[PDB]
């Protein structure tokens, strides 16, 4: 009576629909720190004159 | 050393004859890497094998 396993398996199958289906979701988290910079995009470049 | 979180090595490799404790010569140290780690140091420790 009220006490129930929390964990619950899910229900991801063929037969679900869009809103049911899984879904691989990735969050992407940044950070901006008083330490120095460690990750940044790719810089572009061309010939030599 | 550590400056602003950037921590610098610079090094090199000489001969000696070690006649006293040390050379009374001058040799310049070239620099090897600089790491941007972002932490505090103030104090450190020797390894031997």
Known sequence: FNCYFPLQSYGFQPTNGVGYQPYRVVVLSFELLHAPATVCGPKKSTNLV | ?49
């Open chain 2, 1 to 49: 050393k550590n400056i602003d979180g950037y921590f610098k090595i610079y090094s090199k490799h000489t001969p000696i004859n070690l006649v006293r404790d040390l050379p009374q010569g001058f040799s310049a140290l070239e620099p090897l890497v600089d790491l941007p780690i972002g932490i505090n140091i103030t104090r450190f420790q020797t390894l031997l094998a």
